[PDB]
Each structure stands twice: as C-alpha cells, then as structure tokens.
Design a protein around this ligand. Structure first.
Ligand SMILES: [Cl-]
Lengths: 242, 242
C-alpha cells in the first residue's frame, strides 16, 4: 500500500525548498512518502538515466566491462572532472554526460526505444536527441516509477543479462559502512523547466532493503548537496540508518 | 620490486603492538612493507580463508547466490550475531564460522584441496578437520601470498566462474565513500601461537588500486580494531586516502 507522512516536509522547508521523498520497504511491501501527489509527478530523469543507459550499453556490447576506458574527446568543458579519461565506474561517479551521449549514439534510436519499453521505464518516450533526450527531450518518469524500475534491477528481473545488471549495480555504489550500503544515482535537470535534482537508489541492510527516489526544487547549483542530505535525514528519522 | 619502510613501525609501537603491513601499487607494480621478513612469514589464515572458501562454495553450487539463506542451527554461541540466519553477505560481514564450516563439509576434503591448488593459495595444505583446518589445521599463508591471491581475484584470473569472483568481491565490500572503496576481510587466529589478527584486501581509486595485507600480534581481543586502524594510518601516510 502507501502511507503519507507529511512530517518529512520539514526537512525540505528547513532549507527553503520543496520536494518529495519516496521510500519502499521491500520486506513489508509498503511505501512511504511526504507528498503522494508529487510522488507520481513525472519529470525529466536527467543523469538518473545513466542507469538504464549503462544496462543497455553493457547488454549490447557498446561497453564491454567496467574497465574499458573512454578517452576524453579533448573538448574543455566547464565541469572539471569531465576533462579526463573515464571508465564506466568513474563515468557514473562524476555523471560524465559526454561519455553516455556517445553510448546513446552507438545504441541508436531503434534499440534505445525497444529497451525502455522492455524496462517499462517512465513514459517510454525518447523523442528528441538520441544523445540528449534524457536532458531536454520527451522522456518522463516519476519517483514511484523510479522505485519500480530499481526494484527490477535489484532482483535482476530486467530483460538484460544478469552480468549487465551486476556491473551497473557495482557502478551505483555510493556509500558503504558497517551499518548500510547505498547504491544510487543523482540527477540534475536544468535544460527544461522546472529545474529539479534527483537521487534514486536503495539502502541495503542485513535483512532488508529500502528503495528510495527523491526529487526537489533546484533553482541554482548551490543546493545540489541537499539531494543526499534531505534523503538521509528522512532515513535516520525512520530509523533505517543511524 | 620491493621497498622497506621502517617508519611505519611507529604506527605499531604507538599502539605498542608489532606486525607487518604490505602494500602493492598495481599501476606501478611496486611493493612496500615495514618488515620484508614477517611479510613472508606464513600464519594460519583464520577468517581470511572465507574469501577462497566462498569462491569454491559458489563455483561448485554449495552456495547458489548471495541471497540464499543459511538458517541458524539453533545452537547458542557467544557471538550474538552468529545466533541468527545468514546469507553470504552477512556471514562474511560478521565472520560467521558455523556457516562456512557447513560450506567446507559440503565442499569436501577432495574438492577443497584441488581448488586451493588451482588458486595457488598459501601452502595449499588442508590437513586436519575439513571444517576447521583454516583455524587449527595445516594451512599457512603469508602477507605477500595474500596479495598474490587477491590480485588474481581482482582481475578475475582465478579458475572459477567470473560470476563467482564478482559475487565474492561484492561480499568483501567493507567501506566506500567519495574518495575510495575498500574490499577486504578480517582474521583472528587464536588456536595456535602466535595469536594474530589479519586484514587483507585492496583500496579502489578512480585510476589505481592498492592491494594490502597485514597481520599483527593480538594477545587479547581488545586490540582487534587496530587491524583496520593501523592499516589506515599507513594508507594515510602514503597519501593513498585522506
Ligand atoms: Cl559492490
């Protein structure tokens, strides 16, 4: 089912912002959010799309494995970490758009479209640039739809090789300690209004898994750190993490 | 090549203990240690043997995957976390001996021996009880021999399935943040002198990997935390981590 908990809304206004956090207890099969409405609002995925793109790139052979290097094309860009060689792990760590734009071009309009249909991903609409539709195209996805897609990836139920799904879940590794493991991906939608920041993934525990997907209003880049801070503040409130 | 750095001995004496730390820069193919001697002295592997034990159990089907549950046998033991159900991830997280003792019995004397020979693991000698030879049997391994085994696992060069090595490398996940990822395993040998603590693994960086293996004198369990603490102070000294 689905319970609404508006107490979490504090964590958003405490930073003079608005957004939604959506949690899903896999063992109890129960969902929780502060805004049931916005939980189902579909937005541009932005860099969260690097998850399915990786799966498709790996499954079709565009990316052989997580060690293959993708040479910097030489064009100096405003994001410093982008102006260097990368592999799949580092490309996802620093959200290197140009690397995944090349992946999309090699994937192609036809194969990309069929795969998102197999994934049941968002509105399944890739209209726009094959190499930028997830930034300024027609694809839309809600927080709950992120949760549903991520759950499939966790259980290796997507229609790609088990190896492909493991590698992506490896590249999603973000934080790990004696208490929890976080596999997730961030996103920053700016090319089309409204500007929002994403953070989608799950928190692994000893005997349970909590999937999460959040988006928030992101007028400027000064609040990108809140994507993780607010989510973690909610996780701790619900005693999922210390 | 191999350089000795006796300055690291401070980190041992500042906690008034003695041991060896062995580092390996994979990119430069250079080794570093505070005691080239003890670096090659072979000890009982203790719970560090759970790495090769996991590999064999997965590759032979004793363990189907990292989700298969191994129910607590009902026997109360002094380690609280042992008196509960486990999977591969939690069994390795909490060094649950009873689970891997069952693995060994199902692996068997014969197959365990062939696999450790194929792995070139330690002295490859399993004399003793199949369910405790890594605790009080005849198997021995040195810090530098740990590095060689771990390096093979990193490159998926051991003679088991690539999937088997990926899952084990998942279960080895210990720490991960924006700076580094640590995949490692601890060990505590007590049944035969000298009592020691193990810590072997590697540190993943964006463009490099540092393998490490250390052991230290462990008269009481009060100093088990020094296995990780001393290693990390060496890592910090060498500017491998912040
Ligand atoms: Cl991992």
């Amino acid at each position: 089912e689905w319970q609404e908990n508006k107490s979490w809304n504090a964590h958003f206004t405490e930073h003079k912002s608005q957004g939604v956090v959506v949690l899903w207890n896999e063992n109890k099969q129960q969902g929780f959010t502060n805004n049931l409405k916005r939980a189902n609002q579909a937005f541009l995925p932005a860099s969260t799309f690097k998850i399915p793109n990786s799966l498709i790139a790996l499954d079709l052979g565009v990316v052989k494995d997580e060690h293959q290097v993708f040479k910097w094309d030489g064009q100096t860009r405003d994001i410093a970490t982008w102006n260097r060689d990368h592999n799949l792990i580092t490309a996802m760590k620093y959200s290197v758009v140009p690397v995944y734009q090349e992946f999309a071009r090699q994937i192609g309009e036809a194969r990309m479209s069929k795969m998102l249909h197999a994934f049941d991903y968002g509105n399944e609409d890739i209209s726009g640039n094959v190499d930028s539709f997830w930034l300024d195209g027609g694809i839309r996805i809600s927080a709950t739809e992120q949760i549903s897609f991520l759950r499939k990836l966790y259980h290796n139920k997507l229609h790609v090789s088990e190896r492909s799904q493991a590698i992506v879940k490896q590249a999603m590794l973000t934080e790990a300690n004696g208490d929890y493991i976080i596999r997730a991906k961030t996103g920053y939608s700016t090319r089309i209004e409204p500007k929002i920041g994403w953070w989608v993934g799950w928190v692994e525990l000893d005997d349970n898994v909590w999937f999460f997907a959040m988006n928030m209003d992101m007028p400027t880049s000064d609040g990108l750190g809140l994507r993780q801070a607010i989510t973690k503040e909610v996780l701790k409130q619900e005693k999922i993490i210390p």
